[PDB]
Amino acid sequence: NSALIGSENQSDSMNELNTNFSMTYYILTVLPGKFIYWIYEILHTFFVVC
Amino acid sequence: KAPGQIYAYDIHNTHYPYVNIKQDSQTQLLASFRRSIASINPFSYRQVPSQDRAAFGLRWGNAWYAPNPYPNGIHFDRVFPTHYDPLAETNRTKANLQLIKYAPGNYSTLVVTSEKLPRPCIRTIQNYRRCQMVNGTEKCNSEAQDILAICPNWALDHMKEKVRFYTKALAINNQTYIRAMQVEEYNQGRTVADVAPKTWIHGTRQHLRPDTMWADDRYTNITQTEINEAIKRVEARKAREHEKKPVEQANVNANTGEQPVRVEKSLYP
Amino acid sequence: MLLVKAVKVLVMGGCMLPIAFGALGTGVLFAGFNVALSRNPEETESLFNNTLMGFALIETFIFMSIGLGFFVLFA
Amino acid sequence: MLLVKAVKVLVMGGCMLPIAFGALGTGVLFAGFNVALSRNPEETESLFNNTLMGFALIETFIFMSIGLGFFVLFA
Amino acid sequence: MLLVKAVKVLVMGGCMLPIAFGALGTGVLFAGFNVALSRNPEETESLFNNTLMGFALIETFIFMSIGLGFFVLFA
Amino acid sequence: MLLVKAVKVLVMGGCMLPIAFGALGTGVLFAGFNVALSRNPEETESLFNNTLMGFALIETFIFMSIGLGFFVLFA
Amino acid sequence: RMRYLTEDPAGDDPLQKTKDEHLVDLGFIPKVFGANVEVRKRAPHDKYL
Amino acid sequence: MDNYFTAITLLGLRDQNLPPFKDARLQRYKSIKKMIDLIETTTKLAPPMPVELFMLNPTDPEWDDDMTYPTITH
Amino acid sequence: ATRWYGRQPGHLLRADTYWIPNLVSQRFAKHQPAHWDGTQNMPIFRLADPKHKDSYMVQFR
Amino acid sequence: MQNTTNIVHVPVHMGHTHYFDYIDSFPKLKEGPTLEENHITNQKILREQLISGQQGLEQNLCLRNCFKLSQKRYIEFCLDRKCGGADFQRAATILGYTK
Amino acid sequence: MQNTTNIVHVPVHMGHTHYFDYI
Amino acid sequence: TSESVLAYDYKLWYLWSGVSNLDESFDMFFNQYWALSLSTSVFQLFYAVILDRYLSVLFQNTPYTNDWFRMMLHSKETALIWLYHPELSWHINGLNQFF
Amino acid sequence: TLRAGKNIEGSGQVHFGYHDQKWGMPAIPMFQLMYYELPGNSIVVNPCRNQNYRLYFEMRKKLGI
Amino acid sequence: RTSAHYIEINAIYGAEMMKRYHKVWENIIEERSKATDQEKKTRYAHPSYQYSPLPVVSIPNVLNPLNLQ
Amino acid sequence: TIFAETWEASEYQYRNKANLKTLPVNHLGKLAELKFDFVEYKAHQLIACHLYERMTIHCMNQYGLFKDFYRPECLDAQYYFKTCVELNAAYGIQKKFFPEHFVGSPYARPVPQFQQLGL
Amino acid sequence: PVKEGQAKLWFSTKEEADAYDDKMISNIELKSQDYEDENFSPVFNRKTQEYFLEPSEKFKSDFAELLRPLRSLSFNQVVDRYVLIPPNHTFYRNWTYEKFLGGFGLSYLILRELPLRNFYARVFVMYAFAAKVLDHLGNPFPFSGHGQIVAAADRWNHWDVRCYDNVMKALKYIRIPTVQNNIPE
Numbered sequence A: 001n002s003a004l005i006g007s008e009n010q011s012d013s014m015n016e017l018n019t020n021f022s023m024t025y026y027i028l029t030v031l032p033g034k035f036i037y038w039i040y041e042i043l044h045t046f047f048v049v050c
Numbered sequence B: 001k002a003p004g005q006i007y008a009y010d011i012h013n014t015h016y017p018y019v020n021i022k023q024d025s026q027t028q029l030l031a032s033f034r035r036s037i038a039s040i041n042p043f044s045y046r047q048v049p050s051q052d053r054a055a056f057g058l059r060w061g062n063a064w065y066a067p068n069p070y071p072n073g074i075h076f077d078r079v080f081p082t083h084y085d086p087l088a089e090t091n092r093t094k095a096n097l098q099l100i101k102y103a104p105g106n107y108s109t110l111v112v113t114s115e116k117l118p119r120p121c122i123r124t125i126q127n128y129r130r131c132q133m134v135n136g137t138e139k140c141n142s143e144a145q146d147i148l149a150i151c152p153n154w155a156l157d158h159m160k161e162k163v164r165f166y167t168k169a170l171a172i173n174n175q176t177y178i179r180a181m182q183v184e185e186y187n188q189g190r191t192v193a194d195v196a197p198k199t200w201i202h203g204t205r206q207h208l209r210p211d212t213m214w215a216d217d218r219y220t221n222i223t224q225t226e227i228n229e230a231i232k233r234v235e236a237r238k239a240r241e242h243e244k245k246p247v248e249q250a251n252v253n254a255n256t257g258e259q260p261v262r263v264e265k266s267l268y269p
Numbered sequence C, D, E, F: 001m002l003l004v005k006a007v008k009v010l011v012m013g014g015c016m017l018p019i020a021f022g023a024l025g026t027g028v029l030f031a032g033f034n035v036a037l038s039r040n041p042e043e044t045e046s047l048f049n050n051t052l053m054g055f056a057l058i059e060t061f062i063f064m065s066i067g068l069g070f071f072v073l074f075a
Numbered sequence G: 001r002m003r004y005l006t007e008d009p010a011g012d013d014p015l016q017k018t019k020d021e022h023l024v025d026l027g028f029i030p031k032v033f034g035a036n037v038e039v040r041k042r043a044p045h046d047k048y049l
Numbered sequence H: 001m002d003n004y005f006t007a008i009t010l011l012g013l014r015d016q017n018l019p020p021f022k023d024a025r026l027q028r029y030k031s032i033k034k035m036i037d038l039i040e041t042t043t044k045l046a047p048p049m050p051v052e053l054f055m056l057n058p059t060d061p062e063w064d065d066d067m068t069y070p071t072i073t074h
Numbered sequence I: 001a002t003r004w005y006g007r008q009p010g011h012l013l014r015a016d017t018y019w020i021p022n023l024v025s026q027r028f029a030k031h032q033p034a035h036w037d038g039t040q041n042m043p044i045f046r047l048a049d050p051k052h053k054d055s056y057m058v059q060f061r
Numbered sequence J: 001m002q003n004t005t006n007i008v009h010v011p012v013h014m015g016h017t018h019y020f021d022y023i024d025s026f027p028k029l030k031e032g033p034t035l036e037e038n039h040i041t042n043q044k045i046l047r048e049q050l051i052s053g054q055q056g057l058e059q060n061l062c063l064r065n066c067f068k069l070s071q072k073r074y075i076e077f078c079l080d081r082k083c084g085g086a087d088f089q090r091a092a093t094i095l096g097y098t099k
Numbered sequence K: 001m002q003n004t005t006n007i008v009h010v011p012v013h014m015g016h017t018h019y020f021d022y023i
Numbered sequence L: 001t002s003e004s005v006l007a008y009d010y011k012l013w014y015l016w017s018g019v020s021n022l023d024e025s026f027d028m029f030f031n032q033y034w035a036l037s038l039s040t041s042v043f044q045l046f047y048a049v050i051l052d053r054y055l056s057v058l059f060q061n062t063p064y065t066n067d068w069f070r071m072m073l074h075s076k077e078t079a080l081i082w083l084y085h086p087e088l089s090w091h092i093n094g095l096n097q098f099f
Numbered sequence M: 001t002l003r004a005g006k007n008i009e010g011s012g013q014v015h016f017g018y019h020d021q022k023w024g025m026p027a028i029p030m031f032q033l034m035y036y037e038l039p040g041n042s043i044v045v046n047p048c049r050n051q052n053y054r055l056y057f058e059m060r061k062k063l064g065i
Numbered sequence N: 001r002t003s004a005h006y007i008e009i010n011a012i013y014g015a016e017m018m019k020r021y022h023k024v025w026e027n028i029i030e031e032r033s034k035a036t037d038q039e040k041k042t043r044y045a046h047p048s049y050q051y052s053p054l055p056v057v058s059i060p061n062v063l064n065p066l067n068l069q
Numbered sequence O: 001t002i003f004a005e006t007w008e009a010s011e012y013q014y015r016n017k018a019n020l021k022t023l024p025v026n027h028l029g030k031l032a033e034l035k036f037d038f039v040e041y042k043a044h045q046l047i048a049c050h051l052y053e054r055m056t057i058h059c060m061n062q063y064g065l066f067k068d069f070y071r072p073e074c075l076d077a078q079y080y081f082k083t084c085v086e087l088n089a090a091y092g093i094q095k096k097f098f099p100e101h102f103v104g105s106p107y108a109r110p111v112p113q114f115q116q117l118g119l
Numbered sequence P: 001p002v003k004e005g006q007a008k009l010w011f012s013t014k015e016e017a018d019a020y021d022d023k024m025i026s027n028i029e030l031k032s033q034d035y036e037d038e039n040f041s042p043v044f045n046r047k048t049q050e051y052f053l054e055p056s057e058k059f060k061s062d063f064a065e066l067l068r069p070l071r072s073l074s075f076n077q078v079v080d081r082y083v084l085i086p087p088n089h090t091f092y093r094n095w096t097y098e099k100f101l102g103g104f105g106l107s108y109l110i111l112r113e114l115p116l117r118n119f120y121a122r123v124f125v126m127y128a129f130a131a132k133v134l135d136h137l138g139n140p141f142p143f144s145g146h147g148q149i150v151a152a153a154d155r156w157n158h159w160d161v162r163c164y165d166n167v168m169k170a171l172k173y174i175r176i177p178t179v180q181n182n183i184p185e
């Protein structure tokens, strides 16, 4: 819901305390790393299938 | 007329203990440096509350800290059965919309609460009890009818169920009383006079040896020869105890199309 | 159980053998690219392309083992 | 029983040995191609086809090994 | 139980095999780079760059192994 | 407990494997430097520099292995 | 057999059943029984599944 | 699992360790069954004390004012 | 009662070309005679229940 | 069952108007005296109570505060300790709790 | 109350397979 | 209802973690009397019963036993009084049952 | 409503079953003159609360303030 | 809503009365220490109880287990 | 009170109420998060809420209560222990006075006597 | 031979005890570390002393340090010190958060003037600064959600709304729905 505009899914973790034990500056450290692995999975897939 | 301080302030003696739970060198070094300049640092935030100023909680790096919620297997699936096991991972991963929704109350406990009856209904009860201890029960009909008329019906249903619960809890506490005051075969004819002058400490490890071989130095001077001799003596006693053995009982859960009994499970598979 | 797992993880360690040979073959690959470049530098870009192309076929074997490794470790 | 299964999985790890020699044989193959190419680039096409062709036969044995690997592990 | 931990810490040692092969591959690469340089020193800067580039690929396997190592050592 | 300790020291011994590979890679690198120098001795200073640099990269693996070795032996 | 022995909780709505307070006012005082804790549910012969 | 600390104390986990075998370990759990019923009963014999001692009666008409908390909107 | 009757599983054919494992496996399967035992509920096929071991791939929505 | 279902025990009359649904009147509703009339009526009670109902008041308040206790044994203790040895039934008649 | 809730009186064993839930 | 809404807002969470000595959520009684029961003493079993009765009080979050209405021995202000008078657990359990 | 103890199947207020629906106010002047949305800021505390301050004025005079 | 007066007045009342209970609690413990085992088991006891002495054991009389006042 | 190391998960689930919580076994994975060395016997890890208690003691011995105990591995053990004994005390009381609430109890859905059927 | 100590057995007769010793002694498996021994175990050598978890001195000292400011006081002083704090509801307690969260705006006023020449370099700086904010704000879109701030728990939390009962039920209680799925009557 943190990525949704005007979310109505209130029971989906919207009204709860959601902390984590990952690296802070999430969109600068963690989320980019998730896209780095995404780019690897698709580049490795293209090389293998092609 | 100074502001009031809580007991925690006298433990740390400061409002600015930079407590960060993230155990990385970058974080703790900055905290130690920030903990020293907190008196002349404009970018200082309190973590110890007071009467005049609120405070923040524990910090996790740049974010905030909260313990991992107590493991809870209740979850709700979205796309496919995830088979969530709260004991399979240390930290609980974030809930994705298309994967899982966790149970409510990340930080919650189980308690018992009670609805508060309406004020006018309470006043009718106070008048009945008061008129009861003064004039007796036989002269409180009008006050009793005022309860049945003014108290809403849901309140009367609560009052009705309370008496049925405490009647249940009364019998449960008295059944426990019976099992507790039951005299076992090993205490027949024994009274407080047969009790030994011992206290709780006399049954601890220092006075009463546990049922383990290495609780103390009792068997530390035992040689292999003494062991082989003991194996011969215990086998001699088994020539008198092995003579009897319980007979095999019939299996109550033989039929698989029948609701089986929850019999005590075997110690080993 | 754990013992069978112990030899599975043991096998998983064996996957580092191609990772080792892949390094030597890599050093050999770039070694030839260097000497070959000196004899005919007019076609540098051509040699350079085939150089990295070979290093890919190396990792083809490498990733394959890692796949086989994680698979048998859990299958 | 438990011993044989532990050996079956063990042999499955041995299949990763050719995967290692295939990497070295690959780097060596393209190492030579660069040299052979710099020697006579006019005939690149012929060298190139023979280059990749040999590589095919190389990983062919590698794939063949994995077959025997899973065979004993399941047969 | 304890035995799986033992084979794990041992596999972690196996990662030193690529570390060994990477050394020999490095010696070979720079060996050819020297001979390749003497053949045509006019392009020393080109060879020098490609030389280090190959070494960078050697450490890739090194990082791949140690990475896989600590993982299997803790996973 | 005592078993893993025996496995720790064992891995610590395997650290001498790159040490062996570094010896061969060293002789190889200087072997090319001697030959490469005879081909074009006018630029001995250049080859000599590139030679020592390679050796530095060889001992890099050495320090890494010994580094990892003591780690698992104490961590 | 498992689905024959697969029931749902809470049964049916009690408020749609005959009340005890109403029978008393009708002339029949109901008797209170205890739960039968000794019976075990079992599936019938296969022909009835 | 109520009366946790009481049960853990009767088993001796504060001063010793349980036997490493299930047979004797499970018998020791069932051994405190009588004592828990006793200690539970002892705790239900406390005599009463005036409720108007550390707590004002909320049903007193004095508190029918339903007064709010005055605040400053800083 | 309506919920209970609804759980008595219905009969679902084994023949399935939509799941590729069965598209291959059922080509080597041997159709053996199912001798009537005197009932009307012989489960000679799979059952239309999401939790059946031969129907878990089927989506019940 | 309908979510907007309510059971009312007193009569109500609904308005038969378009686009609106509400209770327009209550059958047999009598309008009592105005706020200004009840005010004057109460001022007369508070005035006499201010002039003629303040002597001997401290004693009655102690009796009233004693009778607000939970148990009778505490009421008796409150009267004997705070009200100068008053009787239970004798005080209940003063307060008007006796029949 | 969960809609897909069932009370079973005989033991069942559920498979712990990814993407599937069944007996 | 329809009221004024803000584009961006912050929601505070006064978490009762029970593991932070910086705030008033730290249960000093539980940790002190628990650590006290760990050491060998003649009252080692008595302290265990006191703790089990303290947990039965937290279990009763009624209008007469809760921190919200600032009831004695239930709110954050009165957490230190448990260290001096842990005997009052029975007085409360009866009080909550009376009301 | 969920926190209050009522589980919710489905979502929204377009009740499929036997319930009254309340569609949004038609955005046309006819309905905009007859209806208007409930302003929460108009729900207030009864001013009778301010009559409790009478106790404060009396206690101050009793204490000689 | 519950009266804000009650919440704040009762919070003070309860604490002010605990200070007076602490003093009474001390005099009771003191007076009970000088009491015989016979008295502390028969006084406030049920009428149907027949007293039977227990073996004398050493049990300290500690007011506050924690070293508090 | 539970007089064993194991309990049937269904016996602590509600039959006529939504199940929003379980009473899980001790999380043994949290024991491997302690970086320091400690001695723990397997004969103490299954009993309810005790493993979290021993871990808290180990963490309060290695570290203290100030600026060193405030690390995630040690605070979660203290929170799990404080939370485990609170839930188990509530479930235990609910098991004592409200046994009809749980699955497996014959009073959750009483089976009638044969005299109530009219046959 | 059997060694005696302060910890004694629980048997009245000496035969039952001797039977217990022979019973335990018959189960001993000696594991020696010296070669040429009939019971020799290089690995899997069992210890002969049992470990017992006990609260150390560092454990008992820190717990006693939490009570240091109380040992110097009497119960009456403790209550008047930490319990009966004179009521004063005139403070702007929430200034602590206004200063903290208001700093993002003040910091932005300073950071938006960075002399970094390249525009796309300042894009990285603001992206980094936004990552610092979104750790608290959470959702970057407007009218979508609320930020998340963990605050300290004190006696003054919700002090001006303690009188309202529905606010307590909404914050504290998560009621369990029943088969008769309705809000409590």
Ligand SMILES: CCCCCCCCCCCCCCCCCC(=O)OC[C@H](COP(=O)([O-])OCC(O)COP(=O)([O-])OC[C@@H](COC(=O)CCCCCCCCCCCCCCCCC)OC(=O)CCCCCCCCCCCCCCCCC)OC(=O)CCCCCCCCCCCCCCCCC
Residues within 6 Å of the ligand: A022, A023, A024, A025, A029, B022, B024, B026, B027, B030, B060, B061, B062, P125, P128
């Ligand atoms: C007479 C003199 C009088 C004046 C004297 C003045 C003296 C001033 C003294 C100042 C004292 C210290 C100041 C303290 C206040 C800090 C305030 C602050 O915002 O910091 C927050 C920041 C984040 O920490 P936090 O928010 O408190 O959270 C706690 C943990 O981080 C939480 O743990 P976590 O794991 O969850 O966090 C994740 C972690 C993630 O891990 C990281 O830390 C990320 C960093 C990884 C990269 C590291 C390499 C960086 C080096 C690159 C340049 C190298 C050049 C040379 C290389 C040669 C190689 C041989 O941290 C982050 O997320 C960092 C994100 C924010 C930083 C990234 C964006 C940086 C912008 C860069 C733009 C540069 C353009 C030029 C602008 C310069 C001026 C504005 O803390 C710091 O980073 C402290 C900085 C310490 C300084 C380090 C020195 C850097 C050297 C730079 C070299 C180039 C310049 C050399 C100039 C030489 C001059 C002689």
Ligand SMILES: CCCCCCCCCCCCCCCCCC(=O)OC[C@H](COP(=O)([O-])OCC(O)COP(=O)([O-])OC[C@@H](COC(=O)CCCCCCCCCCCCCCCCC)OC(=O)CCCCCCCCCCCCCCCCC)OC(=O)CCCCCCCCCCCCCCCCC
Residues within 6 Å of the ligand: A005, A006, L002, L003, L004, L005, L006, P142, P143, P144
């Ligand atoms: C061609 C494209 C076509 C496609 C179009 C898109 C179609 C798809 C739509 C998709 C919808 C997405 C759904 C979003 C979910 C969230 C919705 C939500 O929750 O809203 C709740 C919120 C609830 O408010 P409400 O129910 O409408 O009204 C009752 C509230 O209680 C009232 O709130 P209050 O109590 O706080 O304040 C009451 C009032 C009290 O104040 C007053 O009455 C005094 C009025 C004075 C106004 C002066 C403003 C300040 C100016 C200062 C400068 C000096 C002024 C000098 C003159 C003053 C003289 C006194 O103050 C105001 O509300 C001021 C309103 C400002 C109006 C100014 C604009 C005039 C109309 C513009 C029309 C053109 C744009 C629409 C698109 C057109 C497309 C063809 O409604 C809003 O959406 C608020 C506006 C936010 C709209 C944005 C929605 C999307 C979110 C992302 C956009 C980010 C904005 C920046 C974008 C980039 C712009 C360049």
Ligand SMILES: CCCCCCCCCCCCCCCCCC(=O)OC[C@H](COP(=O)([O-])OCC(O)COP(=O)([O-])OC[C@@H](COC(=O)CCCCCCCCCCCCCCCCC)OC(=O)CCCCCCCCCCCCCCCCC)OC(=O)CCCCCCCCCCCCCCCCC
Residues within 6 Å of the ligand: C003, C010, C013, C014, C017, D003, E002, E003, E007, E010, E014, F003, F010, P029, P031, P040, P041, P042, P043, P044
């Ligand atoms: C590209 C390269 C990639 C890298 C590849 C890396 C591959 C790594 C392979 C590693 C995996 C295989 C290793 C398995 C180890 C298991 C044996 C073991 O460690 O000794 C435990 C074993 C048991 O401890 P214990 O002291 O007898 O316990 C006494 C208690 O009273 C006992 O009573 P308790 O009541 O305390 O019960 C304890 C319980 C505890 O149980 C457990 O916790 C785990 C038990 C797992 C047992 C699984 C049994 C499966 C059934 C297998 C049936 C066939 C076994 C014999 C055939 C093996 C060959 C296929 O039961 C046991 O202890 C069962 C153990 C029974 C003995 C097993 C047979 C020993 C292995 C035979 C070969 C040993 C020498 C080979 C020569 C090597 C020279 C290079 O130790 C011995 O029995 C004495 C011999 C110790 C070894 C010789 C030490 C001298 C130095 C040798 C130098 C080489 C060291 C190793 C490095 C090799 C590198 C060259």
Ligand SMILES: CCCCCCCCCCCCCCCCCC(=O)OC[C@H](COP(=O)([O-])OCC(O)COP(=O)([O-])OC[C@@H](COC(=O)CCCCCCCCCCCCCCCCC)OC(=O)CCCCCCCCCCCCCCCCC)OC(=O)CCCCCCCCCCCCCCCCC
Residues within 6 Å of the ligand: B034, B037, B040, B041, B042, B043, B044, B045, B062, P099, P100, P101, P102, P103, P104, P106, P107, P111, P128, P129, P132
């Ligand atoms: C005579 C010439 C001068 C000679 C003297 C030379 C020596 C100069 C330095 C010494 C004098 C400094 C004066 C102030 C005393 C500060 C002492 C101190 O210990 O501060 C450490 C202070 C606090 O350390 P901290 O605990 O880590 O807090 C920062 C955390 O980020 C906080 O993170 P958080 O999450 O924990 O909290 C969020 C935070 C908000 O935090 C943030 O969001 C900022 C995050 C940074 C951006 C994110 C990217 C960070 C990337 C990481 C790497 C950054 C490296 C930066 C290194 C910079 C080195 C200084 O919000 C708040 O907590 C409260 C903020 C509200 C405070 C309102 C402002 C009060 C200050 C006084 C105002 C009047 C001063 C003049 C006005 C300014 C000039 C027009 O460190 C910093 O200052 C951080 C840099 C902030 C920029 C300040 C630049 C001001 C420079 C002014 C120079 C003087 C005027 C120049 C005039 C030129 C003509 C002469």
Ligand SMILES: CCCCCCCC/C=C/CCCCCCCC(=O)OC[C@H](COP(=O)(O)OCCN)OC(=O)CCCCCCC/C=C/CCCCCCCC
Residues within 6 Å of the ligand: B042, B052, H073, H074, P090, P091, P092, P093, P095
């Ligand atoms: C921001 C507006 C400034 C100009 C406005 C001009 C118009 C003035 C009209 C004012 C009318 C008066 C209305 C009443 C104002 C009420 C203010 C208020 O509520 O907050 C007061 C309250 C007092 O604190 P307490 O002790 O808790 O309260 C005791 C109450 N007796 O003040 C505060 O909250 C403290 C913060 C005040 C604002 C701070 C300004 C922030 C700017 C910071 C930059 C200044 C430089 C900093 C340098 C740091 C060097 C170390």
